[PDB]
Design a protein around this ligand. Structure first.
Ligand SMILES: CCS(=O)(=O)Nc1ccc(Oc2ccc(Cl)cc2)c(-c2cn(C)c(=O)c3ccccc23)c1
Length: 127
């Protein structure tokens, strides 16, 4: 089972803008999560070939990872903060759906999600 193409990070047909919230998501939120000790398995798409997980993309049909999110933020792919927040939430949810409660990868996702939620509670009001 080969890997799918990664999620899109550039598309001239999709509208986009910069907002103060999206700039916070890159400079504060992504930056903090990216340097966490447990970030590395989330820094690129799940490579189901390398991991010998041929079922992964039979079960997870909306893949997401922080490397994709980072590129989307650096490329100003998004129209609003909610789109980007949804990508982080999809990344976490996928991990919790695919893996067993208590698996190491789930504990690593949960630590990142705890930091994410702190930072999202501090999301600035739109200017
Ligand atoms: C960089 C993406 S990669 O695919 O190229 N490499 C890579 C390497 C290891 C991975 O898993 C572990 C990592 C650390 C521990 Cl302690 C335990 C498992 C994963 C991985 C990530 N996710 C989000 C999963 O849901 C997942 C589910 C099952 C197996 C592996 C993974 C990906």
């Amino acid at each position: 089972s080969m890997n799918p193409p990664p999620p899109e990070t550039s598309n001239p047909n999709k509208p986009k803008r910069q907002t103060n919230q999206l700039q916070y998501l890159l400079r504060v939120v992504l930056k903090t999560l990216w340097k966490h000790q447990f970030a590395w398995p989330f820094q690129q798409p799940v490579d189901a070939v390398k991991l010998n997980l041929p079922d992964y993309y039979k079960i997870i049909k909306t893949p997401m990872d922080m490397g994709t999110i980072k590129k989307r933020l650096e490329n100003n792919y998004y129209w609003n903060a909610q789109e980007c927040i949804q990508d982080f939430n999809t990344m976490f949810t996928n991990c919790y759906i695919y893996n067993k409660p208590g698996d190491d990868i789930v504990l690593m996702a949960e630590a990142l999600e705890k930091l994410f939620l702190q930072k999202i509670n501090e999301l600035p009001t739109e200017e």
